[model samples]
Target: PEVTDQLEWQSNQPWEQALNRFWDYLRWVQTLSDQVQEELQSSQVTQELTALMEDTMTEVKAYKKELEEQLGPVAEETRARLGKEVQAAQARLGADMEDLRNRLGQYRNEVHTMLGQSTEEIRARLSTHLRKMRKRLMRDAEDLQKRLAVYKAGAGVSAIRERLGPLV
Candidate 1:
């Protein structure tokens, strides 16, 4: 979590982490420089020391800004990035569902097309040929169709189709 208050949040996050790193680098260089001076006491200081220190500080400042941006007003940029990613995920999910629906419909149509065998004709011929008793598993599949015949008449295919179309 990041503190929203700049005063409180300063030196409180990942940049703070890098700030420590920056200090560690500076301290290490200073210690090494000290050791060298100890070995060679009369050696005069060169401009390179100041130049290197300045460059290192500049680099540390840039690095700190990069991490700090992730926490501050730059939070909006982070939010936008996250929002786009979520939208993309939603789009992918929708596309996958559509693909699955298309494949399922094609398979369903193929299966329906295959059920062309005439059950009544086969049973009649087989029962007679085999001299076996045959019984109706269902006396009339459309027995209830008589009473509700008015409703299939009440709403035509168009009305039902309008409600959900082929999606159902």
Candidate 2:
């Protein structure tokens, strides 16, 4: 009777250990997910790209203002000539700014799309992993159940053998 009880207790050990390991794996995955999210949010390349765009915008605006101020003090005859030149320069600057803005807008959209896709991809992979692990856990539990049933039958047979041993 004591041996049977000890065997039954031993049979439970793997199930308990499996559950502990599964929970630990779950926590580790969660930590990894959080770290990835944090890293994406604070990505240095994205920050530098944004800073560069802002600096370009600031410089363009400052240059435009300086050009207008410089054109203010010229003689009327020179002013008319300079005004046409200034207008042409301003037009070119405007076109360049528009191009820059379009490119920046496109870049922003691409970055957002890339980040979104990566996040979704990570989530899908993680869920797939969890599903596989759960399935394995279930299979393990079923195997353990089968093993326990066999152990119980073996114990019963031994008990019966012990009882008949004295008579035999």
Best by TM-score: 2
- Stretches of candidate 1 above 4 Å error? 1-74, 115-168
TM-score on alpha carbons, each prediction:
0.24, 0.30
Score candidate 2 by TM-score against the native.
Answer: 0.30
Instruction: Give Cα distance to truth, residue 152, candidate 2, Å.
Output: 3.5
Q: lDDT tens digits, residues 33-114, model 2?
A: 6564444345542354345434433443443343445343445675455445544543443344344334334433544777
Worst 10 residues of 1 by lDDT: 132-141
Candidate 2: worst 10 consecutive residues by lDDT? 146-155
Q: Where does candidate 2 clash, by residue pair?
A: none
* Candidate 1 per-residue lDDT over residues 3-94, each given as its tens digit: 53355334333333433443343334233243533322222222333343344334434433433444333446654554444334333433
lDDT of 1 at 44: 24
